[PDB]
């Protein structure tokens, strides 16, 4: 299947408690591979996956320079946004950026992204054509006009179709033993009595990669869309993921329910029954 590279950066002001903090992380699919933390001592882009450590010293120098420059730019952007909105210096504000690219199984470019959020809400985003911007409000339209005048989209298009794809292709090769794998979910069901009239049936998926998965409960072949409890997919800490789904069943009706599991590592979806 296809693959993705993403970088996520968060800038947070903390008025009265220091200067703003910048944190950036890089991912290939669901595997983190670098980080930068403006509060940390190293002041370097740091490895976080084994297969990136083979990069030479000039990779780390170049990546460190690029991310430290972004850190400084987004710190000034917090100031500019404060001014655009006439917000008080007393408030703590957040600027998030995401960028990256998707490639197909054959390595061809599938999609590019370059987008910002301010205080947790869309601010500006490069459109799929990589030529135009979506601005979310009147402040972002000031930015949109500025970036149109400076032809920013041309430079980001060049990055996304060029450097981004080249790096992702190389990372996929260097970490192929690990990044091109699928671990199928190990599945089981547990049963937990509540009262003497009701019990919880919990359907489990463990140890799977990548994180995308679908768990659903059915009763007599009819979906239980609204009476299911579904927890967020969570990391195990070892590079795999976990998830469960639960239904409350009247005592004695356990065998009416089936759990259904879809994952790209399964050649066919599963059906579990208590």
């Amino acid at each position: 299947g296809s693959h993705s590279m993403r970088y996520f950066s968060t800038s947070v002001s903390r008025p009265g408690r220091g200067e703003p903090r910048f944190i950036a992380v890089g991912y290939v699919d669901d595997t983190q591979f670098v980080r930068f933390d403006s509060d940390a001592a190293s002041q370097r882009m740091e490895p976080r996956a084994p297969w990136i450590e083979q990069e030479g010293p000039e990779y780390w120098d170049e990546e460190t320079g690029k991310v430290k420059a972004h850190s400084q730019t987004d710190r000034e952007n917090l100031r500019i946004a404060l001014r655009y909105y006439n917000q008080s210096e007393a408030g703590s504000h957040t600027l998030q950026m995401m960028f990256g690219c998707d490639v197909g199984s054959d390595g061809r470019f599938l999609r590019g992204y370059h987008q910002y959020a301010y205080d947790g809400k869309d601010y500006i985003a490069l459109k799929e054509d990589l030529r135009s911007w979506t601005a979310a409000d009147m402040a972002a339209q000031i930015t949109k006009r500025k970036w149109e005048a400076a032809h920013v989209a041309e430079q980001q298009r060049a990055y996304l179709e060029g450097t981004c794809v080249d790096g992702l292709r190389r990372y996929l090769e260097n970490g192929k033993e690990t990044l091109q794998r699928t671990d199928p979910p190990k599945t089981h069901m547990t049963h937990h009595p509540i009262s003497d009239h009701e019990a919880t049936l919990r359907c489990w998926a463990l140890g799977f990669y990548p994180a995308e998965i679908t768990l659903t409960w059915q009763r007599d072949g009819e979906d239980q869309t609204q009476d299911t409890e579904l927890v967020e997919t969570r990391p195990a800490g070892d590079g795999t993921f976990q998830k469960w789904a639960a239904v409350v069943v009247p005592s004695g009706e356990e065998q009416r329910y089936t759990c259904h599991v879809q994952h790209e590592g399964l050649p066919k979806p599963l059906t579990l029954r208590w």
Binding site: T73, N77, Q155, G167
Partner: peptide, 9 residues
């Protein structure tokens, strides 16, 4: 590989 360019809003 990180973006080669940041820009001010």
């Amino acid at each position: 590989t990180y973006i080669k360019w940041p820009w001010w809003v």
